[PDB]
């Protein structure tokens, strides 16, 4: 009876090894995928930040000129 016990345990064991290999392959591939996604997200957010700061300084320049115009008009 021990021969069948060993046979069944061993067969389940190679099944578990193969499925563990599939799991780790999926894990590493998905980690690479997330890394690339995060890198593009960071680059993308940096571009948005830069354009926003330029946009804000342009609006500030407009506001300063507009204040100067009102100062001239009041006088």
Q: For binding to its own copies (CB under 8 A), which residues are involved?
A: 29, 33, 36, 40, 44, 47-48, 51, 55, 58-59, 62, 66, 70, 73
Q: Among another protein, its own copies, none, what binds residue 35 when CB lies within 5 to 8 Å by partner kind?
A: none
Burial 36-58 (b: 16+ CB within 10 A, else e): eeeeeeeeeeeeeeeeeeeeeee
Residue 74 is classified by DSSP as H
Take residue 23 and report the two structure tokens written for it: 């799991």
User: Closest separation between CB of residue 23 and another protein, Å?
Assistant: 5
- Total residues interacting with another protein, rule: CB under 8 A: 30
């Amino acid at each position: 009876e021990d021969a069948y016990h060993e046979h069944q345990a061993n067969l389940l064991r190679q099944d578990l090894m193969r499925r563990q290999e599939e799991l780790r392959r999926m894990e590493e591939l998905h980690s690479q995928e997330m890394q690339k996604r995060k890198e593009m997200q960071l680059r993308q957010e940096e571009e948005r930040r830069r354009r926003e700061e330029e946009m804000m300084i342009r609006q500030r320049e407009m506001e300063e000129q507009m204040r100067r115009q009102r100062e001239e008009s009041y006088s």
